[PDB]
């Protein structure tokens, strides 16, 4: 079997992408943030503290005839940006774009951090990293992808994120009409539970390509591109007036500047990120300082190929017994 679902940016800056997911019987449709950087499927629910819900669509297990409480199971997660949530666990039927999994662990939030409450358009997250990172205790739970793997035509899913436009998540098949050229595959390390790979180098604008190994994770759940300080300094040095601002928390640039493209290596292939993708707009309403889409990973401890990089490519997440990542131009 296969599944295919449209994913849509939540705002004009592509800060995140939401994808409709059907949960329960009869179906309750929630718009979830597909996150290859985490491994929990959690949702706003009828159990969430009412003061922490502001416009989100909630999952109501009491209205689903297939929902079963997972006795004694709890979950608690903290994200690298300081976000967090926690609650109890149900199992239920979950469908994504025609692909159905029965007995999927649906983690019901009792408490969410303020950043989720203020994001009215995200009803929850659907984790797509490896199941070793799932936070359910005392019995760890499998991701949607892991539960679907056996029934998929091919044990893959693909991410085709749009720039200021809708995109597609496909499960079980590779749409050979969605990309140009060939797909370049590269090795994945699962030792930390992430889709972790090694980029072969970078170039700024039309400059010389610098061959150098950059270890990082492919993370649809992170907006920006977080790279080592040396790389990020070399990029912003080519933007007149750009500087690192401690008060803002990263590199900013005059909104009137034109940004150079950024190229990253995948084996012998090259993925080019257009300069317009790196513009994240004024730091505050009316400001003439704009926030940059490429920032330093020095404070994070790991390099993150977030949406800024992934939306420049067609990305294959190959969940075979030896997992690999595929990149193609589009």
Ligand X SMILES: NCc1ccc(C(F)(F)F)cc1
Kindly tell me the sign of the dihedral angle through the C-alpha atoms of 307, 313, 319, 325. negative
The correct pick among 3, 155, 167, 221 for binding ligand X (CB under 6 A) is 221
Position 295 contacts ligand X (CB under 6 A): no
Of 14, 33, 35, 88, catalytic? 35
Position 16 contacts ligand X (CB under 6 A): yes
Q: Which of 264, 261, 253 is nearest to 227 (CA)?
A: 264
Residue 4 is among the residues annotated as catalytic for this protein? no
- Stretch in the footprint of ligand X (CB under 6 A) among 65-73, 115-123, 150-158, 263-271: 115-123
Query: Binding mask 253-292 vs ligand X (x if CB under 6 A, - otherwise)?
Result: ----------------------------------------
Shortest distance in whole angstroms from residue 150 CB to ligand X: 26
Ramachandran class of 281: left when φ > 0, alpha when ψ lies in -120 to 50, beta otherwise = left
Position 145 contacts ligand X (CB under 6 A): no
The correct pick among 222, 263, 295, 296 for binding ligand X (CB under 6 A) is 222
Task: Name residue, tokens 């800024």.
Answer: 308
Shortest distance in whole angstroms from residue 327 CB to ligand X: 19
Task: Name the residue number minimizing CB distance to ligand X.
Answer: 80
Kindly tell me the sign of the dihedral angle through the C-alpha atoms of 260, 287, 79, 7. negative
CA 50 to chain centre: 27
Check if the beta carbon of residue 45 is closer than 8 Å to that of residue 138: no
Of 38, 85, 86, 199, catalytic? 199
- Stretch in the footprint of ligand X (CB under 6 A) among 52-60, 111-119, 179-187, 317-325: 111-119
Position 157 contacts ligand X (CB under 6 A): no
Residue 35 is among the residues annotated as catalytic for this protein? yes
Q: What are φ and ψ of residue 65, in 5° steps?
A: -75, -10
Q: Which of residues 31-60 bind ligand X (CB under 6 A)?
A: 33, 35, 37-38
Q: Which is nearer to ligand X, 107 or 119 (CB)?
A: 119
The correct pick among 17, 44, 116, 145 for binding ligand X (CB under 6 A) is 116
What would the DSSP string read from start to end of 298-310? TTTSSEEE-HHHH
Position 160 contacts ligand X (CB under 6 A): no
Q: How many CB atoms lie within 10 A of CB 208?
A: 8
Half-sphere exposure of 95 (CA within 13 A, CB side): 13
| Geometric angle at alpha carbon 37, from 17 and 224, rounded to 5° | 55
Kindly tell me the sign of the dihedral angle through the C-alpha atoms of 84, 90, 96, 101. positive
Position 219 contacts ligand X (CB under 6 A): yes
Q: Which residues bind ligand X (CB under 6 A)?
A: 16, 33, 35, 37-38, 79-81, 83, 115-116, 119, 122, 219, 221-222, 300, 302, 304
Just list the catalytic residues.
35, 199
């Amino acid at each position: 079997s296969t599944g295919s679902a449209t994913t849509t940016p939540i705002d004009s800056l592509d800060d995140a992408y939401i994808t409709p997911v059907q949960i329960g019987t009869p179906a309750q449709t929630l718009n979830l943030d597909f996150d290859t950087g985490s491994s929990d499927l959690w949702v706003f629910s009828s159990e969430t503290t009412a003061s922490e819900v502001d416009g989100q669509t909630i999952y109501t297990p009491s209205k689903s005839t297939t929902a079963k409480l997972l006795s004694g199971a709890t979950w608690s997660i903290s994200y690298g940006d300081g976000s967090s949530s926690s609650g109890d666990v149900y199992t239920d039927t979950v469908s994504v774009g025609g692909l159905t999994v029965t007995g999927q662990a649906v983690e019901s939030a009792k408490k969410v951090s303020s950043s989720f409450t203020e994001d009215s358009t995200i009803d929850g997250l659907l984790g797509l990293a490896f199941s070793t990172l799932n936070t359910v205790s005392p019995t760890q739970q499998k991701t949607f992808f892991d539960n679907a793997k056996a029934s998929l035509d091919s044990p893959v899913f693909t991410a085709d994120l749009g720039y200021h436009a809708p995109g597609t998540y496909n499960f079980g098949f590779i749409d050979t009409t969605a990309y140009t050229g060939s797909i370049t595959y590269t090795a994945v390390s699962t030792k930390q539970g992430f889709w972790e790979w090694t980029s072969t180098g970078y170039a700024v604008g039309s400059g010389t390509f610098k061959s150098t190994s950059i270890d990082g994770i492919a993370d649809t759940g992170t907006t920006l591109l977080y790279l080592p300080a040396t790389v990020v300094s070399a990029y912003w040095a080519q933007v007149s007036g750009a500087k690192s601002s401690s008060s803002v928390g990263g590199y900013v640039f005059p909104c009137s500047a034109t940004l150079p493209s950024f190229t990253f290596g995948v084996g012998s292939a090259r993925i080019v990120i257009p300069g317009d993708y790196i513009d994240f707009g004024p730091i505050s309403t009316g400001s003439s300082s704009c926030f940059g889409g490429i920032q330093s990973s020095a404070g994070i401890g790991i390099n993150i190929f977030g949406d800024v990089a992934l939306k420049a490519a067609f990305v294959v997440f190959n969940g075979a017994t030896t997992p690999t990542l595929g990149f193609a131009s589009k």
